[PDB]
């Protein structure tokens, strides 16, 4: 079964072309719509097709964001096209993206089910690539707003990580309010739990810190089906937020009473074989004050990633590590001096 469409390339100028594909199978479903896998007839390359319902009143925000992104750790929009679908008289937007076979969720689940942890070399590779993708999107004012393991795509043979699902992504403008109900259970920053509408891109850094801790532990660090349960788990690790810290993440919640828990030592939260650099990185990402958390680029420069910068490092499968040092001026713009650390002498 061959489907031919007239699709517009994602990057470059608006000059459509005939794209033919086959072997269409469903690989994802949800409130967003459906993600398919397909093979392009010309090259034989696998692609993913995200199909979503198109709002008649305005251009799809995810498409506007995707057309402006170009980074090795962000899934690439190859083409886009409009089509019919399940609901009659409704137009659908189809995003043809580069296909990535695995997710951090599935991979971590294998390890947790086998009563093991993912080797720290992979924790470093994946976490570093996530912080690069965040550094890049944050350099445009764009916040992902839904960082979680299912959104971190992985190619197991090359150890490449690609951030995906820009359905909640938004360019945050200071003074313009944002909906607080974005971000998934376990990964929500405490300002989002308190329903703040004036949050910054630093909510992605809290989410990434939750992913790091979960990869170190083998289970979520702040679980719970309600915000109050999530908050008790946060207070158990971080200690009680001060009135000042509470004011920094939604000031309308300053008069509420919180359980009095003393600041637990981060060394006791993880298994004894956990690298102290990973623990130090966690404590700097999972902070109450949104401005106290490391930026993505500062996290890339952390000592936990020094092994990645060694010229002799190789993947466990014997292959070379993927591209890690091809930083652009755009990507370094939050702190250009960091290139001194980020690009090692051998690169
Ligand atoms: N199981 C599975 C599985 C594993 C790998 C892929 N590969 C892949 N490759 C390129 C792009 C995308 C993509 O844009 N996905 C999404 C986009 N928007 C929302 C949600 C998703 C999504 C849904 C389910 C799982 C993970 C992401 N996914 C797909 C499914």
From Swiss-Prot:
GO terms for cellular component: axon; beta-catenin destruction complex; centrosome; cytoplasm; cytosol; dendrite; glutamatergic synapse; mitochondrion. It is an enzyme of class 2 (transferase). Its main location: cytoplasm. The keyword Nucleus applies. Residues 21-305 form the Protein kinase domain. GO terms for molecular function: ATP binding; beta-catenin binding; dynactin binding; kinase activity; NF-kappaB binding; p53 binding; protease binding; protein kinase A catalytic subunit binding. Its EC number is 2.7.11.26, 2.7.11.1. It is found in: Cytoplasm; Nucleus; Cell membrane. Changing residue 61 to A: Prevents the phosphorylation of phosphate-primed glycogen synthase. ATP binds at residues 27-35, 50. It catalyses: L-seryl-[tau protein] + ATP = O-phospho-L-seryl-[tau protein] + ADP + H(+); L-threonyl-[tau protein] + ATP = O-phospho-L-threonyl-[tau protein] + ADP + H(+); L-seryl-[protein] + ATP = O-phospho-L-seryl-[protein] + ADP + H(+); L-threonyl-[protein] + ATP = O-phospho-L-threonyl-[protein] + ADP + H(+). Belongs to the protein kinase superfamily. CMGC Ser/Thr protein kinase family. GSK-3 subfamily. Higher expression and activity of GSK3B are found in the skeletal muscle (vastus lateralis) of patients with type 2 diabetes. Several potent GSK3 (GSK3A and GSK3B) inhibitors have been identified and characterized in preclinical models for treatments of type 2 diabetes. Monomer. Interacts with ARRB2, DISC1 and ZBED3. Interacts with CABYR, MMP2, MUC1, NIN and PRUNE1. Interacts with AXIN1; the interaction mediates hyperphosphorylation of CTNNB1 leading to its ubiquitination and destruction. Interacts with and phosphorylates SNAI1. Interacts with DNM1L (via a C-terminal domain). Found in a complex composed of MACF1, APC, AXIN1, CTNNB1 and GSK3B. Interacts with SGK3. Interacts with DAB2IP (via C2 domain); the interaction stimulates GSK3B kinase activation. Interacts (via C2 domain) with PPP2CA. Interacts with the CLOCK-BMAL1 heterodimer. This is Glycogen synthase kinase-3 beta. It comes from Homo sapiens. The chain holds residues 36 to 382 of 420 of the full protein.
